[PDB]
Amino acid sequence: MKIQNPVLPGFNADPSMIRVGDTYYIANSTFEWFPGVRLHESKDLVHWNLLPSPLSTTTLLDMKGNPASGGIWAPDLSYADGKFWLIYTDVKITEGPFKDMTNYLTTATDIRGPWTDPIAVNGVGFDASLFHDENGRKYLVQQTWDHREYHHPFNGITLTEFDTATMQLKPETARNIYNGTDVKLVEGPHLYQISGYYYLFAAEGGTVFTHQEVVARSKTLDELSFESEPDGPFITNMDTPDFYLQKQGHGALTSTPSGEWYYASLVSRPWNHTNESSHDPRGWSTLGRETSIQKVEWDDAGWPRVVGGHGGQVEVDAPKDAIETTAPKDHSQHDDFDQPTLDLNWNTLRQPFTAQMGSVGNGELKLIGQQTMSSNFDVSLIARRWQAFNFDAETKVKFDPFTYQQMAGLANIYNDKHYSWIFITWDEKKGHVIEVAQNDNNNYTSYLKDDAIKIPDGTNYVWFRTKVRKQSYTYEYSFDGQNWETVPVELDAAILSDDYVLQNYGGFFTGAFVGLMAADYAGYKRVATFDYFDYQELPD
Amino acid sequence: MKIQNPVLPGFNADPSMIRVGDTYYIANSTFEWFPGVRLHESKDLVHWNLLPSPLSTTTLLDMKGNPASGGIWAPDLSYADGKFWLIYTDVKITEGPFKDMTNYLTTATDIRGPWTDPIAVNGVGFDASLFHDENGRKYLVQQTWDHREYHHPFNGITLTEFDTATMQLKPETARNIYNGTDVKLVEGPHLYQISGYYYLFAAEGGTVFTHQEVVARSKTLDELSFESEPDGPFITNMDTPDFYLQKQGHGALTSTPSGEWYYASLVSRPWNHTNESSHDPRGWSTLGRETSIQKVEWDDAGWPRVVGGHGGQVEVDAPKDAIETTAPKDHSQHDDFDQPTLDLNWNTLRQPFTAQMGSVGNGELKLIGQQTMSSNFDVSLIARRWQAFNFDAETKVKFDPFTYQQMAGLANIYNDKHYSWIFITWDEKKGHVIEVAQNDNNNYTSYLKDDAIKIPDGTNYVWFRTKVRKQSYTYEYSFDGQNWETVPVELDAAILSDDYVLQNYGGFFTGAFVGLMAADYAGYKRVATFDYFDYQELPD
Amino acid sequence: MKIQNPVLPGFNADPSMIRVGDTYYIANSTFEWFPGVRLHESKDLVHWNLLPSPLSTTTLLDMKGNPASGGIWAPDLSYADGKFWLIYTDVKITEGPFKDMTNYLTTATDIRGPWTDPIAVNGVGFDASLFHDENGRKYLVQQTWDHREYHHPFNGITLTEFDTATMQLKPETARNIYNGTDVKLVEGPHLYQISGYYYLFAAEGGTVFTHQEVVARSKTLDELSFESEPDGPFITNMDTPDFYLQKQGHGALTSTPSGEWYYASLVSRPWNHTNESSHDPRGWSTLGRETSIQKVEWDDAGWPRVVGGHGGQVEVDAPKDAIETTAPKDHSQHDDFDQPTLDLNWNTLRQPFTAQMGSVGNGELKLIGQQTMSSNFDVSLIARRWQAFNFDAETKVKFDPFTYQQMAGLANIYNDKHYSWIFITWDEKKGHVIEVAQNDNNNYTSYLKDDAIKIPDGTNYVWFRTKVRKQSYTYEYSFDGQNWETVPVELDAAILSDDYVLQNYGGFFTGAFVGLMAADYAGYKRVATFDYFDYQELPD
Fold first, then answer.
1. Positions of the site: Important for catalytic activity, responsible for pKa modulation of the active site Glu and correct orientation of both the proton donor and substrate (chains A, B, C) (predicted)?
2. How far apart are CA A466 and CA A486, in angstroms?
3. Which residue of A67, A512, B152, C319 could cross-link A386, Cys pair, CB 3.0 to 4.6 Å?
C-alpha cells in the first residue's frame, strides 16, 4: 500500500513510465553500460522486477569507444497499435560545443523481445520521445541542441511529424512548440492528450540540484502555442535543500486503470562528509540518479500538481486498484555462476559479454584479461550497481600472472578515470601479490607498492571483499575464506559519485558499480577464475 | 646528389626505413588518420614517391571511436624470407596511468599489397619491431609500459622470441635487454646484426625537444647485456636550440648497396610568434613530425656517428650508387574528382571512405553530412597534410541547408578539439549564409554570428579559399570564383600544432591538415557537392 | 689555487661583483628576506666572508606585506669617487601585466656602513645598474618593462643619464642602447669601458634553464649602437643539459690587479628524483640560485670568452696575484644565542628583528608568537639558507600553548605557500603535543592529527631535529636530548625548490631556508624559548 522513494535504488535514471492494462513498465537510461536500456515491471508501483534489457546486441547498440556518459541517454517507451516502441539515443560527444547523437527506433510485440533491427530516426537533440496522437498521426518531440556559443544551447522543444508508413520524419514539419522558462536547459519533453488539451511535460535547469519539471498546454501542436502552468514548477528540489530527495525533474506521467495519476522522476540522495556544509556542496551521489514515483492530482484550472507539494514525498499512496507484485526483498545478489548466462543484474562496459571476454557456467566465471578499466575498448569486466549505501561484496578468485601487466580482482567503478580495486598481480621481488589501486581523475595511486602482500606458495584461490559504508569503503583479503585482513586504507566513496565527476568532466550521468575484472595489457590473455560473487546489502 | 631535410615534409613521423636491393622504403605513423601506415619509395634517398597505404580495410584497422593521437603509432617495416612484414600498433588510451595497445602483424609479397589478415601479437608496449636474426629465429623488440606511478613508466627494452611457425610470441623468453641512460623514456628499439655484434638503436627523452637516439651493442641477446655507445648520444637537437632541425631521434638505420650508411629520423621545424623568446617556447610545429635522413659513419671502435655531428645536417650527400628517382616538384595537389577513387594524398578520420560518407567520380566529390569534426565517429571529411609553411587551398561547393545543424566547407584540422573552417550553413533570419568558426581546445568561436554573409538568391556554388602564411591564416569566399572577399579574421596557426595540443592533452603526434567536410547533426544526411580541390604550395 | 663552483652555495643570486684595490666584493639579491642585499668579501675569489647587509633598517627597506619573491631583486654595487654606491630595487608585483618596482640609491664610504638614507631614482625596469663613465658622467642602465601584451615584455636596455650634482635622472636622455638577440628577455645590463669600447653585458632567456649572458659593444652610448658578440652567447648551460652547473647567465665582470678577468654568475645545481628523465624536468633547485665564478679571456677580435667554453667550469684557476683569504671551512652554524644580536647568517621575513618579534642573548632566543608562516606580515621567525645538500639541524625549545592556534618549532621554508615544520602545539584531548605539518601550495597536511605525540607532564624543553638528505627530509624529536624518535614521514625537498614554485607562481627567486619560529594567531603573544640552534653540513 506504500511506495517508498526511491522505488528503483541506485543508477536508474531518466524514467520513461507507461501502463498497458494493469501492468506498469519503466525504462531507464544506461549510458555506456551494456546491455542498453533497463526495464522494470510492476502492477502496484511499490514492488518492481527487472526485465531483460532490449538493446542486447551490437546490431541494436554499438558503443565500443564511446566516452563515459555517452551512449544511451533518456529512453522513451510507448505502447500503441498493439506493440511496444522504444526510442533510444546513442550520444557520441559529452563535452564542448557539440553533442552528436543519433535517435533510433526499435519495436516489439512482447516487452521481453525480440526487438526489431533499429531504424535511424534523426539527430537534432536528445530526449527524443514518440508521441502517438489519437488521430493516428505520430510525431517525435525532443530537446534541440544549438552549438552556437552566442545563443542558449537548448533551443526549445522541437516537434516533427512522422510518415507512419516508413517511420521516417518529414523534416519540413519541424517546429519549436515551447521555449520553456527563464531556468532554461529545456529538455525531456513528453506530450499527452488529456481533457481536450495537449499537455507538454519538460525538464529544465540541468540534471543537478537546479533540476525541475515544468508543464505547458495547448489546444494544438502549433509553433510556440504551449502556455506554461501558473505557480510552477511542477516538481523541483532546488528550493528544498534539506529534503531526503533531490534533483527531481525529468520523468513521465501515467494514469492508473481507475483514473488516478502518478509521475516517475529521476531522483538522488546526495550525502555529505562530516566536515562539509550541508548546503555547499549539497552532496555526493554515489547511487547516482535513481527513480522515484510521486502522486499527481489536477487543480480546478486543469493543471497537474504533485501531491505533498512541488518537492514531492518520500512515501506515497499506492494506486487504489494496485495488484500486489512479488519482488525480491532487496537487491542483494548471491551468484554461484551455476548458469550458462549472466544474471540480469550484471552489465559490461560498452560491448556484449562475448567469448573474447570470457565465459560463465558450471560454477565459475572466467574472465580473459584484455584492456584495463581505463580503456573504452575491450574490457573484460562485469559489474552491478551499488543499490544500498552500506553493503559487503565478496568473491573468490584464482589468477596466475607472470607479469605486472596482468591484474585481476574485485572492483568499484564509476568510469575510466574513477575506479578502485583489490587485485592479484605479479611483482619482480615476490611473484604473486595483492595490491590495491585507485584511479582518481587520472591521479593514480598504488597503495601497497613494494609492500604488496605476498600470496603464499600453496595458495590457489584468494578471497576478496569490499565493505562500503556510505561515505567510505575498504578492501579485505583472505587465503582461506575465514581469516580476513584489512588493507589499511580508507577510500573516499565521493570519488565514485556524479557530483565529483561533474567537477572535471561534462558526462556524469551513471552511478557507482561493484564487480569483477581481469586485465592483461601484455596481451597474453591471462585467465582469472571466480568461483562466486556475493553482494549483501545492509541497513541504512 | 643532395638530400634536403626534411625529405618527407609535413606529418611523416616515426620513420621505419629499409632497403630491398636498390630500393628504399619508409613507413610512417598515421595515428587516427585512415588509411593506416604511410609508405614512400625511392632509389636515391633524395626524391620520394607515395605508395598505397597497407592498412586500408577495417579488417586491417578499426579505429572508430579512437582518441585523437591514438591509433597507429610507430610502425615497423621489414623484409625477410622473400616478403614484407609490417608490425603496427593500435593505441586506445593516450592519457593517464595506462596506454592499452595491441601490436599486430601483416605481411605481403608486394609492397603495394595485398596484405594478409592481421595476427594479434601482444601488448606490453608500443614501438614494437620485428627482428629477423640471420640464424632464422625471430623476435619482437619493444618499449615496455609500466603503469606503476612509483616507477619510471618506460621499463627498459623487452625482447621476446617468436614461434616462427605460428608467429605467436613465447612469453617465457621475454627479457629486458637494455635500460637506457638517465634521459629515460627508452623506446623505438631496433636491432641490427653488424660485424659480429647486435646493435640496438633506441629513442629516449620523449618525442619533444629533449628527444634523442642512443646506440648500444652486445655479442648476445642476453638480459641487460647491451652496452651504451661512449660519447653519446647518436642524434639529438636538444642541445642545438637554434638549429633548423629539431626533435630528431626515433628512426631507423639502413645500408646502401655499396656499404654506405644512412639514418632516417623524425624531425620538426618549430617556428615562433614574433614576440616569443626563441628558446622558450622553442616553438610550434604545425607541420608536425616530418622525416629527415642523415648520413652515418663508423668510428675506429665500431660505433656509428652522424656525419656533421650529433645534431645532423640540413643537406646530406646522397648515396654514391644512388639511382635517380623522379618525383613531383612539390606536394601541390590539383584534384578535379575525375577518378572513381580518392587521390592517395587524401585521408579520412578513423574509418574508410564508404558510401555512407559519400562518393567521388565524374568531376564531383559528394560528402553526406554526418557527425561534426568534434566526433570520433562517422565524420564525412577528407583532408590532406599541410606540407609547406605557405600555401593556398581552394574549393567550389554546393550545399542546401535548411537548419543551422547542417554545415559544409573548407577546413583546417589538427584534432576534434583543434580545428577551424569556413562553411555554408543556415540561419533563422537570412537563410543560406557563410560562417567561420574555430574550435580552440573546446573554446568555440563563431566569428560572424548574426553578421554571417548572406548567400544571394541566385547562387548555386560558393567558392572558398584558405591562405596559410606560417604563423597565421585566413579564409576567403566568392560567389563567382573571380571576385573574392576576405573574412576579416586572422587565425593563429599555432592552435593546429603539436606543441600547443601538448599543453592540455597527452596525444600530440600528428600535424595540421586541410580539407573538405560536411556535417548534419540533425541527422538528415544533407549532401555537399565539391567540384574540385586545389592545394598550391608557395615558397618559404 | 682553485675556485670550486658554486663558490657561494645556497641562495646567493644575481651577483654584482667589483674589485677595490686587492679586495673583491659580491652583492646578491635577497627578495623578501631581511636584511636586504647580501655582501661577501674575498682577496682570492676562492674563500669568501659574509659582511653586514646594507639594507638593515626600515628607512632603507620597507617590505612588510611584500609578495614572496618581490622585494630586493638584482642589486648593483659600484665603487667610484671614493665611495660605494648601491642601486637596489624593491619589487611590489610578481605576476601579471605589471611589475611595479622602485630603484633606490644608497652610498657608504665604508663597505660595512653606515649607508645613507636612500634616494628614489626611478622605476622603468629592474636590474638597474650605475655606470660611472671615465669622463665624469653617470648613467643608469636597466631592463625596460613593457606591460603592453601585444609587445615583448622586455623592451630593450634603457640608458638614462644622471644629473651628477643631485643624482636625479634626466628622463629626456633615456634611450634604448640594445635590443638583445632572438632569445629576448634582455635584462641584467652592465656597461664597462675597456680598450676604447663600451662593452655591454646583458642576461637573456629568463633565469631558468634557457638563461644566458650576451655581450655587445659600441664606441658610443648612442641609441641602438651596440653590436652583438659573434659566436655567442658568452655564457649558458642551456645546451649543456648534463653539466653539474646550470642556469648560468646574469652576473658581472671584474678585472684582477694583474690584468686577469673573471665573471661571477648566478648558477644552480638542480637534482632529479630517481624516476625522472634527467632532461625533463631538468631538475629541482632546493639551494636555489647560487654564485659561480668563471675565468675570462679575450679573443683576437677583442671579444670576451669564458675559459672552458660557454658552459664554464666546475673548477677554475684563482687569480695569479690571489691573496689567500681566511674563511670558515663550511657554512655550518653552532649558535648558543650567547650574543645580544643575531648571528649574521640569520634572516627575518620582510621586517627587522624587533622587540615585537622577540629577543636574543644570555643563551636564549625568545620568539613572541605572532602571525603564521602563511602571512606577509609580522612573522616571528628567524631562518638561514640551506647551503649543503645534506645536513642536520637541531634546536631545544620550550613553549606553553593553551590553544591549537599557538605553534612553535623547527621549520623548513621557501615561502608562505611552501613550508613544513615540527612543532609544539595544544590539542583538546591531550594538551601539549608535537605535530608535523606541510603547506604545499596551500594544500595543507597535518601528518599526525589526533595521533599527535603527547608531551609528558614533566617536560619543560622539547628537542627537535631535521635531517635533510638532498631529495628528501625527515623530522625527529626527543624529550631528553639523547633518545630520538623519527616522525614516520618522508618529506619531498622538491616542494621547497625554485623549479617547483615556478609551476604555479611567477616569483621563484630565493631558495630553501631552515629556522625557528613561533606563531600565536589567537593573538595572545605566547613566547617560545630556544636554547640553541645547530646546523651541521655533511658531505655530498
1. 127
2. 10
3. A512
Strand runs labelled E in C337-405: 348-349, 358-361, 364-368, 380-385, 390-398
How were these coordinates obtained?
X-ray
Residue-wise DSSP of C159-194: EEEEETTTTEEEEEEEEEEE---TT---EEEEEEEE
CA separation for the pair A266, A256 (Å, rounded): 20
Shortest CA gap B381–chain A (Å): 15
Annotate A35-61 with DSSP letters as a single string: SBSEEEEESSSSS-EEE--SB-STTT-
| Phi, psi dihedrals of residue A491, rounded to the nearest 5° | -95, 145
Burial class for B134, CB neighbours closer than 10 Å (0-12, 13-18, 19+): exposed
Count CA within 13 A, CB hemisphere, residue A102. Answer: 21
How far C272 CA lies from chain B's nearest CA (Å)?
10
Q: Are B96 and A521 in contact (CB < 8 Å)? A: no
Q: Which helix (H) or strand (E) element contains residue A141? A: strand A138-145
CB B7 within 8 A of CB B24: no
Q: Report which of B207, B208, B190, B316 is spatially closest to residue B253, judged by C-alpha positions.
A: B190
Which of A32, A63, A93, A406 is the mutation pick for testing B, counting most B CBs within 10 A? A93
- Distance, in Å, from the CA atom of B14 to the CA atom of B24, rounded to the nearest integer, reads 16
- What is the interface size between B and C, counted as CB pairs within 8 Å? 63
Residue C341 identity (one-letter amino acid): T
Terminal CA-to-CA distance of chain A, rounded, Å? 22
Spatial CA neighbour of B440 closest among B420, B425, B411, B468:
B420
- Could you say which of B182, B184, B277 has the minimum Cβ distance to residue C205? B277
State the cell numbers at C66: 611584500
CA gyration radius, chain C: 24
Contacting C residues, span 406-425, partner chain B, CB-CB under 8 Å: none
CB C214 within 8 A of CB C248: no
Label the pairing between strands B235-236 and B212-218: antiparallel
| Chain B hits for A96, Cβ within 8 Å | 374, 417, 439, 442, 444
| b/e burial code for range C225-247 (CB count within 10 A of at least 16 → b) | bbebbeebbbbbbbbbbeeebbb
Q: In angstroms, rounded to a whole number, what is the distance separating the alpha carbons of residues A346 and A358?
A: 14
Name the residue in chain C with its Cα closest to that of B207: C280
Say whether residue B230 is in contact with chain C using an 8 A CB cutoff.
no
Give dist(CA C476, CA C464) in Å, integer: 6
Answer whether A272's CB lies under 8 Å from A316's CB. no
State the alpha helices, DSSP H only, in A48-151: none
Which residues, in sequence order, are CB contacts of B179 under 8 Å at separation 6+? B156, B157, B186, B224
Sequence-ordered list of residues with C-beta below 8 angstroms from that of A275, at least 6 positions apart, any chain:
none
CB A106 within 8 A of CB A116: yes
Handedness of CA B248, B252, B256, B259 (dihedral sign): positive
Q: In Å, what resolution does this model reach?
A: 1.9
> What does the alpha-carbon distance between residue A337 and residue A364 come to, in Å, rounded to a whole number?
5
* Nearest-angstrom CA–CA distance, B471 and B494: 7
Residue with cell 593506416: B36
- Give the three cell numbers for residue B37: 601506415
- Three-state DSSP state, A450: helix
H or E segment at C501?
helix C498-501
Counting CB pairs under 8 A, whether chains A and C reach 3 or more, is: no
Query: Cβ–Cβ of B238/C279 closer than 8 Å?
Result: yes
Interface of A with B in 388-407 (CB under 8 A): 402-405
